[PDB]
């Protein structure tokens, strides 16, 4: 039967071959037009070039700054809050569940819904609705 | 079969300016 397997229709396209006859369609420059910079081998303009006009990424002013504290913080969903370990959640033991990462040292709990098992969170922050969600489930908040 | 070597200037030095 090894000579009977076939792929699904539309899985293959056979690619485009340039400069192979007239009837093949894109022959005689293979769809890159007549003379010009773009028609040359290796030709073209780099990213952001506008033909000499000041590029958009140069006409506009740079703004803001990067905060290092943002790279060491993460957000915790309610859906994944209850599948860490039993019913206790803290800054530690989330890395064991692999939902924040080793380097993260700050975390927050946001309202993502689908929380049923009552859980206790220590050392984390529950914004506004996470507090309500767990309390209905039967959890508690303490710092 | 083999390229020549002397390769003299075949063009005549007479500019029609």
């Amino acid at each position: 039967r090894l000579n009977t397997l076939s792929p699904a229709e539309g899985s293959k396209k056979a690619g485009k071959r340039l400069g192979r006859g007239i009837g093949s369609g894109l022959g005689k420059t293979g769809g890159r037009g007549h003379k010009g910079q773009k028609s040359r081998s290796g030709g073209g303009v780099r990213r952001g070039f506008e033909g000499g006009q000041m590029p958009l990424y140069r006409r506009l002013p740079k703004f803001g700054f990067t905060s290092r504290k943002a790279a060491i913080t993460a957000e915790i969903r309610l859906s994944d809050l209850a599948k860490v370990e039993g019913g206790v959640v803290d800054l530690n033991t989330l890395k064991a569940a692999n939902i924040i990462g080793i380097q993260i040292e700050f975390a927050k709990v946001i309202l993502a819904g689908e929380v049923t098992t009552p859980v206790t969170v220590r050392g984390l922050r529950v914004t506004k609705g996470a507090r309500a969600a767990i309390e209905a489930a039967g959890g508690k908040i303490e710092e | 079969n083999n390229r020549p070597v002397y390769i003299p200037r075949p063009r005549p030095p007479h500019p029609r300016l």
Binding site: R1, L2, L5, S6, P7, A8, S11 | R3, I7, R9, P10, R11
Partner: protein, 201 residues
Amino acid sequence: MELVLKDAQSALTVSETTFGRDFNEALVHQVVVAYAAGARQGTRAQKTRAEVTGSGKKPWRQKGTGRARSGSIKSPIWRSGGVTFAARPQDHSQKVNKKMYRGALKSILSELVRQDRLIVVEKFSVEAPKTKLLAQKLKDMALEDVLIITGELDENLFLAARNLHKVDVRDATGIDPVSLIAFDKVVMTADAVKQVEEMLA
């Protein structure tokens, strides 16, 4: 589902998901193609105009000569040196997802059962390492091109089938889609069957 025997007539219980699922044509073909591509080694190469032995001196002056402009003796449009896009040693192996590999294997096994190309029997062994004995054992079973899959690999069976081209001996762990498809008949021992579900899951 239920797998019948032809020698002991003993019932066997096996999950229908791994032996009674539908046959996925597209999925199986991709795995088979991937397996063939992984068998390549791609040990080839040519020399570009930079790797061809020679010198960079211009064959003749740019102007005055009556023939076409030339830059080097190694240009691809010149005899004895060239190859515009020379090949390089490359790896043709392609990635196949674990689940996709398992799914194709499950699909293949189910269809072998459907086409009755898979025969389950009790322990399959040969008393002595003799190809003659193995040939006799397969002759009375009306089997000529068979893939013997056993739970435990024994040198006695391995040596007996070594000189038989149409016969292959394999372990459950070392099972590949191409071998199952290629071989006309597949014979699996009771032990060999059990390990398949455990690894397939």
